[PDB]
């Protein structure tokens, strides 16, 4: 059970990367890339901007 919250609003510049909202918290966010991450939003897998988002758990 993983959860991540975005500090600001970001827009993914790739088909594999997705965007999220500050209040909109996602789950299943694990650290895969030294600069990027990967989470799951209601069954939506993608990349999380480590520069705009942050891993809670």
């Amino acid at each position: 059970g993983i959860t991540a919250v975005a500090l600001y609003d970001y827009q993914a510049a790739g088909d594999d990367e997705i965007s999220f909202d500050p209040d909109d918290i996602i789950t299943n966010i694990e650290m895969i890339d030294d600069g990027w991450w990967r989470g799951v939003c209601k069954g939506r897998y993608g990349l999380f901007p480590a520069n705009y988002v942050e891993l809670r758990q």
Partner: peptide, 19 residues
């Protein structure tokens, strides 16, 4: 100033050779 511009994006294609 009172406002601050957004932070830069991480290097997705570019990466350092060392730590």
């Amino acid at each position: 100033q009172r406002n601050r511009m957004p932070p830069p994006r991480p290097d997705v294609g570019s990466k350092p050779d060392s730590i």
